[PDB]
Design a protein around this nucleic acid. Sequence first.
RNA 1: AGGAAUUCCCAGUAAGUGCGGGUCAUAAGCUUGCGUUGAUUAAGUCCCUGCCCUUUACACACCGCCCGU
Lengths: 190, 204, 204, 62, 259, 55
Amino acid sequence: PDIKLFGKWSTDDVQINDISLQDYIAVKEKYAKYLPHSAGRYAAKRFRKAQCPIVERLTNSMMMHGRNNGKKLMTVRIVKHAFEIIHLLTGENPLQVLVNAIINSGPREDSTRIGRAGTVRRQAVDVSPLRRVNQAIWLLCTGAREAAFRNIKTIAECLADELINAAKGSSNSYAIKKKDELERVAKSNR
Amino acid sequence: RRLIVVLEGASLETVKVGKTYELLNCDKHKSILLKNGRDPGEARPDITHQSLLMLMDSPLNRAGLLQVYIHTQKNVLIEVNPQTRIPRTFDRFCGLMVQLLHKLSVRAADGPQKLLKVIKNPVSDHFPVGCMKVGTSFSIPVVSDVRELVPSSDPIVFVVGAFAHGKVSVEYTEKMVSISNYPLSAALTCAKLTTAFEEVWGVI
Amino acid sequence: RRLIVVLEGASLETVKVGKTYELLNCDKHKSILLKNGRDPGEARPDITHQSLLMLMDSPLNRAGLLQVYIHTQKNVLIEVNPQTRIPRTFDRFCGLMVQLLHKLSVRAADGPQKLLKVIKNPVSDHFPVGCMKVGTSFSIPVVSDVRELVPSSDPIVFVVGAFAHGKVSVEYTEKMVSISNYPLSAALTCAKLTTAFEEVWGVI
Amino acid sequence: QPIKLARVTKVLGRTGSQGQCTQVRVEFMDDTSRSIIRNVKGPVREGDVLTLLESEREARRL
Amino acid sequence: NYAVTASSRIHIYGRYSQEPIKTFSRFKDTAYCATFRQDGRLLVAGSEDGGVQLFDISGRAPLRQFEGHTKAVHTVDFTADKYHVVSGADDYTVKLWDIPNSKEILTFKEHSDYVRCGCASKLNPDLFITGSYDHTVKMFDARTSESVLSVEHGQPVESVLLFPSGGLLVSAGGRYVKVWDMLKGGQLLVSLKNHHKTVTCLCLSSSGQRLLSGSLDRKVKVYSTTSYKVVHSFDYAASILSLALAHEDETIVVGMTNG
Amino acid sequence: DILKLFNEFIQLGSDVELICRCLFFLLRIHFGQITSNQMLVPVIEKLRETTISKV
RNA sequence: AGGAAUUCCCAGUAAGUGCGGGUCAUAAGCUUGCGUUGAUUAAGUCCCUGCCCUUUACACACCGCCCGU
Ligand SMILES: Nc1ncnc2c1ncn2[C@@H]1O[C@H](CSCC[C@H](N)C(=O)O)[C@@H](O)[C@H]1O
Ligand SMILES: Nc1ncnc2c1ncn2[C@@H]1O[C@H](CSCC[C@H](N)C(=O)O)[C@@H](O)[C@H]1O
Ligand SMILES: [Mg+2]
Ligand SMILES: [Mg+2]
């Protein structure tokens, strides 16, 4: 049999173009699930959350942002509606769009901090792939949450637009601006 | 596109003499400043007062492309609504700042919306993401033309110090520039800064 | 070449309350101001205060290319030395003007050179030969490019109103110009005029 | 300068002085048989792949 | 289901169902040219402001807004691929927009009057035909920055339609309905007049042979394309502004001058 | 430079156990990079003759 | 929608929601049970702020004297 997310989105055609992030994005045949709700224990051990499917990680990270915590079914429906809107607008697999958005949103180097009472000094350092994935998901969720606030637009459309812009690589998205500014600060501080 | 101006190191604080509370001024409160050994001549709200007159009467704010932030020496962040007029004369300006620093907000007498409000530090959280952030200092050897630094369609942040002595040094600026070969006042720096932005952005 | 700016209608005068002499301030002397039915709000020395500061602190006045003349509402004509330093605080500024009017003179504390002293009316006699006079007001419907009005090597006189409300109207001005389509302050007009004349005469 | 990929061979320890980043030894994916010491921020283990936009800088230098 | 646009309201009606099953009412003054996509999930709209609005058939607020036009817009349509739109307004210009990118792809300015009837080809993307009151119908098409073919009509053009097979373009102006062939450019095959007022709308049946023409004189004529002769007539109480046909010829919907 | 200085240490015979322990560690960790550089070809030839002879 | 300062927190944990009891002390706009939903980050250093100890079981291997009054 074939396993499709929500019964309509296939996972076989999804491919990852970044070699570093292949081992930390779980979308392939072993990690294919019908729903982003498994009731697993992925925070029990270090590095175990890299085995969690990325759709479930996006659902979990979308619960902490701007909501009463613990409402997971609502977040699942929001993700489903966002995927439907993405497919309607673009016409390609929303899983590929999410993977491309996460790949593009991840910073490659950050600035480690040396701070005293007077001033702070800087040093550019590298970023591990797990932190890249975590920070990309956090930036996407924060951008969607801030776009949806105080606007006549439900969170699903803002989230869909955020993934579309991030996967396209356009500068209209919050995550791309955050990534560009962080890498620019790290570049100036070498 | 907008201009963000941050007044860093403002000397704004409230003290009590007799039964009255009033803003700390160098000459008016000379006796109490020497008490406890505080350095005289450091309480200068006038620099903050004079600079806001230059900024908010500039046509750039009149066109709606300017936002002003004040970060005082006591680490209190104040946001300024562009719809506000500053008090032009000094004594009532002390009355406003005493009103603001105590009640944490000042409502419009003519409107429901707030005009002055104390907000959460740091100021870097309130800037639009992707904006350029520039510090200003006379000590920079190279004089940079303001017209060249203006972005075409992006917001930008410029930091001007509100002190007679010292250099601007904050965490979030990535370059420090000089725009003249001479030491200028804080009010003149804002007036010279805002005028170049208008003609680039077509505000005449 | 030299730029001469004349501040007309300045509200500078000395009044008697009790046994001491004070400069006429609307905020401070509201009690006597309401008596005799003289209009509150007209007495506005603060307009003069910040205007002289940026004119004094402009780079051209360092270069020796600025002269400032003061013509008050009381028909008192005042010249300034380029070396003069106007106090940044309003209260310390009020002491000198009170000392100015009564003694008719202000000498340097470190030398006999003359800083501030009242001269004879009219000011047009003191003007250099071969000089054109220009008045500045918002009311002119056609805005003039301030960079276009500069003479290459000739002295030029601008008249800026240091009053509260009204229009510039003096006999010796030859033509009237507007520099912006927004109602500006007497202060920011002074900053704009010095900024424009700064680039033409090559001082940066 | 082209973007480089490196593989982590040995995790040395946490710097302490420079925040709390980790000093690691990395070898380039090219067949040049090169190996350098890098500072990495975030949780890292052996076998991870790092993306270096600049590959000339050394973590420990005078 | 069918979308009826009227005044500032676009109503979605089902089969039977006297009351509308859905309503879009957040139009500032009026709405123009509600059209469905080939998948029946998104609909394009127009307004007197000039912004082109994409709507979801299950939502309440537009998904994408296009602000390029300066005056009223009256014709909007999709392309062969379901992800670009072509719009034409009263500012004498016609614009091609991209849906995911949310920006205008291309602009054409070759018309001298109000542009208020656009059509696209299901067979070939970027091949579309536009109509205006300047008596001319220009075919902005291929991948080029100028019109490849133009057609002259003797009266202002109310409606234009494309026959999917054979490259036949039918245009309505005044009483006249003219058929033009694309095998040889600008070839008027048959010009017909069977109405005594202006021909408002022109529709094609499910079968290629039948062609329906509604006009302003409370009469609708059904023709065979093979002979180009009238084969049936319909009489109504008021003037036919809109004519619409369902799958096969199951349902006929006619919208009048009145409500 | 260290390989040149290590060769000078072994020939004198001073603290050979300490230097050889240091010398063998660098060769293993930089084995691939050393092999590529042709400039190091003379260096180990002096090292190879010296080390086994002294030990 | 709550500044400056400041407190607390690592897995069924933070947070939300309901339903009971008043049990020989305490508890009434409060106290204590029980169930429901359920997250982000971290699994390592002594850099700051501190704390606890030391500097007299002879396999192999390793190592080879704390200082002062
Ligand atoms: N020539 C100049 N160019 C840009 N900014 C200037 C300037 N002269 C003074 N300023 C700004 O005006 C403020 C107060 S004037 C005090 C000058 C101070 N000593 C200094 O380091 O520049 C300072 O914060 C400074 O940033
Ligand atoms: N846009 C402008 N151009 C030139 N001078 C101006 C100006 N705006 C104000 N001024 C000058 O500044 C002085 C004070 S402003 C006084 C108020 C008056 N409605 C006005 O806007 O002009 C006046 O004397 C006027 O001459
Ligand atoms: Mg709160
Ligand atoms: Mg409870």
